[PDB]
Amino acid sequence: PAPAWTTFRVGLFCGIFIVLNITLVLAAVFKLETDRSIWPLIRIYRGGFLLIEFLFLLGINTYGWRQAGVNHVLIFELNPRSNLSHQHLFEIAGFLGILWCLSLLACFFAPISVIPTYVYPLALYGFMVFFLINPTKTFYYKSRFWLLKLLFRVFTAPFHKVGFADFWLADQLNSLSVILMDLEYMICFYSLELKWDESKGLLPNNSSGICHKYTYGVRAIVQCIPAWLRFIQCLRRYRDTKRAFPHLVNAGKYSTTFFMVTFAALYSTHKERGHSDTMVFFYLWIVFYIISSCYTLIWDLKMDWGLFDKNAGENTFLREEIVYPQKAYYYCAIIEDVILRFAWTIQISITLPHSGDIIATVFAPLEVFRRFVWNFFRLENEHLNNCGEFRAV
Amino acid sequence: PAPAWTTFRVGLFCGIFIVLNITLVLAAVFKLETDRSIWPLIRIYRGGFLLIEFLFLLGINTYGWRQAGVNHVLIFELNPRSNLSHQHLFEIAGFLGILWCLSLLACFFAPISVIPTYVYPLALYGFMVFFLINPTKTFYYKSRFWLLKLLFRVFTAPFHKVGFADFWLADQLNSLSVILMDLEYMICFYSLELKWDESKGLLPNNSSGICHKYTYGVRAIVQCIPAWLRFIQCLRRYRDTKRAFPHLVNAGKYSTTFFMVTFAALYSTHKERGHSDTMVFFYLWIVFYIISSCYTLIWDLKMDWGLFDKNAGENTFLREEIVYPQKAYYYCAIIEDVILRFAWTIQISITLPHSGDIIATVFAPLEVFRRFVWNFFRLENEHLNNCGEFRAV
Ligand SMILES: CCCCCCCCCCCCCCCCCC(=O)OC[C@H](COP(=O)(O)OCCN)OC(=O)CCCCCCCCCCCCC
Ligand SMILES: CCCCCCCCCCCCCCCCCC(=O)OC[C@H](COP(=O)(O)OCCN)OC(=O)CCCCCCCCCCCCC
Ligand SMILES: CC(C)CCC[C@@H](C)[C@H]1CC[C@H]2[C@@H]3CC=C4C[C@@H](O)CC[C@]4(C)[C@H]3CC[C@]12C
Ligand SMILES: CC(C)CCC[C@@H](C)[C@H]1CC[C@H]2[C@@H]3CC=C4C[C@@H](O)CC[C@]4(C)[C@H]3CC[C@]12C
Numbered sequence: 207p208a209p210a211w212t213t214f215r216v217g218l219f220c221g222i223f224i225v226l227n228i229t230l231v232l233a234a235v236f237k238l239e240t241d242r243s244i245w246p247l248i249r250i251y252r253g254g255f256l257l258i259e260f261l262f263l264l265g266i267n268t269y270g271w272r273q274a275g276v277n278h279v280l281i282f283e284l285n286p287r288s289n290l291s292h293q294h295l296f297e298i299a300g301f302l303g304i305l306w307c308l309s310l311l312a313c314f315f316a317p318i319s320v321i322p323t324y325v326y327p328l329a330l331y332g333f334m335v336f337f338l339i340n341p342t343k344t345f346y347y348k349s350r351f352w353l354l355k356l357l358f359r360v361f362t363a364p365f366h367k368v369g370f371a372d373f374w375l376a377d378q379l380n381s382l383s384v385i386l387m388d389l390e391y392m393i394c395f396y397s398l399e400l401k402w403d404e405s406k407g408l409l410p411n412n413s414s415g416i417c418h419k420y421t422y423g424v425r426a427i428v429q430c431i432p433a434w435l436r437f438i439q440c441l442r443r444y445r446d447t448k449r450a451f452p453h454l455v456n457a458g459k460y461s462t463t464f465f466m467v468t469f470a471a472l473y474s475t476h477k478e479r480g481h482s483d484t485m486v487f488f489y490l491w492i493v494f495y496i497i498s499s500c501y502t503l504i505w506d507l508k509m510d511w512g513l514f515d516k517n518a519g520e521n522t523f524l525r526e527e528i529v530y531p532q533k534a535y536y537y538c539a540i541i542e543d544v545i546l547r548f549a550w551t552i553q554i555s556i557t558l559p560h561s562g563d564i565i566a567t568v569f570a571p572l573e574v575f576r577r578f579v580w581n582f583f584r585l586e587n588e589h590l591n592n593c594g595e596f597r598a599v
Numbered sequence: 600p601a602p603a604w605t606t607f608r609v610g611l612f613c614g615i616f617i618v619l620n621i622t623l624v625l626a627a628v629f630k631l632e633t634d635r636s637i638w639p640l641i642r643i644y645r646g647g648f649l650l651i652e653f654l655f656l657l658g659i660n661t662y663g664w665r666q667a668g669v670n671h672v673l674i675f676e677l678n679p680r681s682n683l684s685h686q687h688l689f690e691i692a693g694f695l696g697i698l699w700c701l702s703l704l705a706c707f708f709a710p711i712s713v714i715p716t717y718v719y720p721l722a723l724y725g726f727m728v729f730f731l732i733n734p735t736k737t738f739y740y741k742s743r744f745w746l747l748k749l750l751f752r753v754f755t756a757p758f759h760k761v762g763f764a765d766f767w768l769a770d771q772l773n774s775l776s777v778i779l780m781d782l783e784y785m786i787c788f789y790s791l792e793l794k795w796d797e798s799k800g801l802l803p804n805n806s807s808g809i810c811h812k813y814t815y816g817v818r819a820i821v822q823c824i825p826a827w828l829r830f831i832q833c834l835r836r837y838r839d840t841k842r843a844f845p846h847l848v849n850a851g852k853y854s855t856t857f858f859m860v861t862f863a864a865l866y867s868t869h870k871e872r873g874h875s876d877t878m879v880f881f882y883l884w885i886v887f888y889i890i891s892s893c894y895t896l897i898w899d900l901k902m903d904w905g906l907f908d909k910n911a912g913e914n915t916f917l918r919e920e921i922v923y924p925q926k927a928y929y930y931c932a933i934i935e936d937v938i939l940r941f942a943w944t945i946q947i948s949i950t951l952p953h954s955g956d957i958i959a960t961v962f963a964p965l966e967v968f969r970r971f972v973w974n975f976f977r978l979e980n981e982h983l984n985n986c987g988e989f990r991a992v
Contacts (some may be wrong), residue, residue, distance in 0.1 A: 207603060208603075210600060210601075210606050213603050213606040213607050213610065214606050214607075214609060214610040215610065216607060216610065217606065217607040217608065217609065217610025217611040217613075217614065218610040218611070218613060218614040219614065220610075220611060220614070221610065221611040221612065221613070221614030221615040221618070222614040222615075222617070222618055224615070225614070225615055225618040225619065226618065229618075229622070
């Protein structure tokens with residue numbers, strides 16, 4: 207198992223997190239100003255919230271993979287000596303989620319003198335970066351180094367060889383593209399919008415902004431920077447393997463992801479300008495959201511998971527062999543990976559007015575939950591079918 | 600060891616406790632009224648605070664006894680099958696200390712409608728009793744029943760046989776007599792002082808009370824109800840063993856505890872009345888505090904612990920054999936069991952005006968700490984010397 211101090215730290219951090227969350231809710235109901243816009247803060251903190259949520263669901267995944275015998279230490283090609291058990295991710299999640307609640311609380315109370323209240327997001331997202339690139343061999347240096355060496359083979363896409371960890375993380379970034387949007391919004395807001403002279407700044411004097419629009423191609427390019435990576439990765443895998451079916455057909459789906467965003471952006475620009483030929487684009491976009499919400503779905507079931515098989519037997523649209531104990535799980539996941547998959551690319555085109563933002567903030571933790579369920583059966587099908595194509599035996 | 604859920608609960612409760620304590624301090628600095636007396640609440644909550652503190656130091660003791668090999672399962676005559684490890688007392692302490700902080704916080708905010716704010720101490724000290732006398736076999740029913748059957752052989756003193764658990768708890772109640780004083784104050788305050796019509800009540804409209812004085816022979820009788828028990832227990836042990844030295848000389852020390860309290864009470868009554876012959880008592884009291892602060896001290900070292908031995912050897916006023924690893928511990932305890940033991944019976948005679956209360960509240964957690972250090976070497980000397988006189992071999 208794990209030492210008795212690691213479980214103590216897990217519990218301590220989760221308790222502090224719970225109490226600080228309740229205090230956050232109460233202070234937001236009572237101590238709030240209710241006179242200035244709160245969105246320039248909601249986005250900046252929504253990024254980090256999605257990160258913390260993702261780091262806890264990934265701790266639950268590493269427990270489900272071990273209880274069911276998936277052997278994720280050979281698939282990732284990890285080291286069978288030292289690995290992060292679920293209690294080592296439940297611990298980083300809580301630690302980084304304590305500072306998030308502390309920053310969000312200080313941005314409400316501002317319980318200090320002349321120091322401005324816009325330095326708290328900078329402090330939080332500076333500490334979150336310096337926790338990762340600490341050169342001193344402490345606080346999980348082996349894991350952070352294994353992750354830093356690998357976040358470098360992903361962003362420089364076509365110059366390396368694609369292993370399962372590169373593919374897994376590059377596909378994990380597809381459902382985590384809100385972090386990039388909110389990391390771009392922080393920069394464009396701190397650069398040319400927030401007035402440093404005023405002592406409040408983060409909640410500006412209003413109740414009209416220039417960085418959350420689909421602007422001159424810089425919100426759309428960051429929106430699908432996580433599809434460009436996997437497009438090039440599949441093209442490289444085709445260039446190397448020469449098996450033209452799976453890799454080319456696969457890249458043809460991120461290709462569709464490319465068209466939806468550009469057509470939505472074109473329509474948005476044309477109407478915010480007020481051109482007469484705007485509506486012709488709105489008919490095209492709808493075709494790409496219907497085309498690409500299906501392409502990525504009939505691929506999750508038939509090829510990623512491998513469920514709708516012909517020689518199933520008694521399993522009624524599942525595989526011949528299943529690993530997870532029960533059998534209702536495979537049907538709840540099937541019914542969920544269509545409901546949550548339709549809404550996922552609404553939120554990619556949609557990222558319209560202030561009613562078009564309480565939808566993005568609500569659906570953002572539902573694209574990091576759909577990936578949490580993807581990770582469960584992708585790894586299982588990779589274990590007993592080797593369908594990724596990445597292992598000789 | 601222990602299951603991985605018990606350590607998680609330990610950590611969770613300690614984290615919630617820490618955060619709620621910091622919130623308590625902040626709300627007492629800021630949200631306070633600063634217009635009404637706060638003592639009628641300080642006493643009522645000081646009782647429960649001492650209880651919670653005692654239940655955590657006793658968890659540390661059960662760890663020190665096991666790491667050093669004291670074998671407290673045979674001395675107490677426990678069951679070698681199921682016993683509370685230190686993590687099962689670290690858990691009850693935190694659980695009961697969460698409700699304490701919640702009650703103390705509600706008494707500050709009063710964050711509910713017409714319901715009065717004096718029902719929170721009643722709620723807390725009703726739940727603390729009903730956690731113990733739950734007939735349903737859940738939430739440590741074996742331990743709570745072993746304790747309830749034994750709190751009955753202690754209060755009915757001379758009709759049972761004195762084992763080590765009876766003596767141990769009856770001597771533990773000597774340094775926990777503030778709980779009884781604050782349980783008597785709660786009753787005499789809720790009975791004839793607090794006006795139920797007013798919605799605040801607990802903080803009365805003032806900045807003159809009739810229940811914390813050394814009153815007509817009730818505060819003093821409850822003050823030394825924990826010395827009467829051990830007096831009778833030693834008399835019974837003499838009646839049975841017929842060895843007249845240790846038991847009679849032992850009872851002769853709680854006899855001295857009896858005289859200090861009555862002389863202090865006589866002096867206090869005579870001066871608050873204003874009699875001319877008051878000061879003659881103040882010379883007697885001082886003789887009993889000097890006589891009885893020495894009697895109980897030269898007994899802790901020579902007979903309870905057994906340190907100042909003649910055949911020590913190289914241990915320089917310790918035993919021939921010592922169990923705890925280091926050797927500075929035995930000297931810090933020697934130097935502490937005189938400093939903290941002089942002040943212990945100041946606080947018994949004292950319990951004088953409002954300057955005579957910030958001393959009792961401050962010294963109350965220093966008589967529950969001096970028993971925390973007693974428990975360490977009493978059990979060790981009982982282990983390797985059998986000096987209690989309670990085991991044939
Ligand atoms: C504005 C908002 C911006 C926020 C910026 C924040 C930057 C990043 C801060 C995140 C902190 C994450 C801490 C590091 C987590 C380490 C997890 C890890 O790598 O372990 C994964 C585990 C196997 O790791 P082992 O250590 O056992 O390997 C040992 C032998 N070499 O086995 C596994 O299952 C793999 C799990 C890997 C976790 C992947 C996390 C990816 C997160 C980085 C993406 C960031 C872009 C936004
Ligand atoms: C106004 C303020 C008033 C407050 C009123 C509150 C009333 C009491 C509420 C207290 C809750 C305490 C919960 C019970 C604690 C149980 C601890 C216990 O008994 O275990 C002690 C342990 C051995 O116990 P085992 O269960 O292993 O025995 C099994 C086989 N028969 O081995 C040990 O080392 C012994 C430890 C025993 C702890 C003794 C605690 C004594 C506290 C009661 C005194 C109360 C008077 C104020
Ligand atoms: C109708 C919809 C919304 C239902 C929601 C689907 C969710 C709750 C279902 C679908 C996938 C399921 C998971 C699939 C497999 C495992 C592995 C197992 O060892 C623990 C249960 C666990 C961890 C399941 C938890 C429940 C689960 C997450
Ligand atoms: C000068 C005075 C105030 C010093 C304070 C004395 C205190 C801190 C000393 C005296 C008795 C000591 C304890 C005696 C023995 C043990 C058992 C051992 O396995 C752990 C250390 C521990 C738990 C010690 C902790 C430190 C201790 C509590």
